[PDB]
Amino acid sequence: ASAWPEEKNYHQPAILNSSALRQIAEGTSISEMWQNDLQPLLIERYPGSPGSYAARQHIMQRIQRLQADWVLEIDTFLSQTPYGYRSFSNIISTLNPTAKRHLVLACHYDSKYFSHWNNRVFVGATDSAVPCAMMLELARALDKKLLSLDLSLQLIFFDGQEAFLHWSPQDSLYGSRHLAAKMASTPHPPGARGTSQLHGMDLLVLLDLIGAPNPTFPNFFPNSARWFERLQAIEHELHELGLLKDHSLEGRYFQNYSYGGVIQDDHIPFLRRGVPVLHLIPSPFPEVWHTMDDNEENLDESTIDNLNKILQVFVLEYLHL
């Protein structure tokens, strides 16, 4: 039996030199992302709504225009909810579908349901319109390098992350609970006898609640800590080369501390099935968490810009591009 599923345990990154780093920093455009990827997503988009459909089309359209050979799949399913049976649609974008191993970046594109209050609508700017846009900007910014692509890249935009009422084991993580179970029972690579698509998940990098000022991301798991350190190293180098905006080491995003317990998110259904996770959610959460103020006005542009550069470098180094 092949031990390829163990390759992830020994995988090392291909570190970019100073020259390559300035190039990545110059390759991403925060204003471009803002107008073309984020704003169309700042709409009410709870599951089943017109917005959900519009968001899903935007994400697909934005990926299809790229040169990289992206394969888009809409994973639609039914699930019981506090309001009865409903339909959900996860969006999966994969480069090299048969590539045994894949680095996976993810977030949820649905927005928590709230009945209109004082003519205000909840759009979950940091939760998680920004993460969505960041993934799209990354796809755009590294498009040329990704075009050259047994390890590849995959993006997952989960639907139904939010609870329709208040968090509950049965009410929340609809999309991820469904996709995890599905991938866990789908042979991979095609024709495989005893390995699943989950065996193929090298690492799940989940972005959530990003876009607020001064985020502090803690290290959550020992089996992905070496990767958390890479993010620290990248942030440090990008900073020393003066490639970050209004950024200080004292107030850096990736600090030297782990988090005791765990935070409920889309990674749970995967983590509980053995998938290594790098959970990029800040602790504490943005002040605007689940408030009508989690809007565009309260987003920190330079912070998102800095994070884009960091994430993009991490991905290129992980994929040896």
Ligand X SMILES: CC(C)(C)OC(=O)[C@@H](N)CCC(N)=O
Contact call for residues 311 and 319 (beta carbons, < 8 A): no
| Angstrom distance (rounded) from CA 231 to CA 221 | 14
37 sits near Zn ion (criterion: CB under 5 A)? no
Pick from Zn ion, ligand X, none: which does 167 bind, CB < 5 to 8 A by kind? ligand X
Asked whether the beta carbons of 82 and 164 are under 8 A apart, the reply is yes
Residue 135 beta carbon to ligand X: minimum distance, rounded to whole angstroms: 16
Measured from the CB of residue 233, what is the shortest distance to ligand X in angstroms? 27
Specify the 3-state DSSP secondary structure of 90.
strand
Q: Which is nearer to ligand X, 95 or 106 (CB)?
A: 106
| Alpha-carbon span 17 to 270, nearest angstrom | 33
Distance of closest approach, residue 317 Cβ to Zn ion, in angstroms: 30
CB of 297 to Zn ion, least distance (A): 18
Does residue 127 interact with Zn ion by CB under 5 A?
A: yes
Q: Which is nearer to ligand X, 192 or 292 (CB)?
A: 292
Q: Which is nearer to ligand X, 108 or 309 (CB)?
A: 108
Q: Which residues contact 74 (CB under 8 A, 6 or more apart)?
A: 56, 60, 89, 90, 91, 92
Count of residues of this chain found to bind Zn ion when the rule CB under 5 A is applied: 1
Return the one option of ligand X, Zn ion, none that residue 83 interacts with (CB less than 5 to 8 A, by type).
Answer: none
Interface ranges with ligand X (CB under 6 A): 127, 161-163, 167, 172-173, 208-209, 263-265
The option from ligand X, Zn ion, none interacting with 205 (CB < 5 to 8 A, set by class) reads none
Contact status, residue 44 vs residue 125, Cβ threshold 8 Å: no
Distance CA 70, CA 208 (A): 23
Breaks in the chain (C–N beyond 2.5 Å) sit after 149
Site residues, Zn ion (CB under 5 A): 127
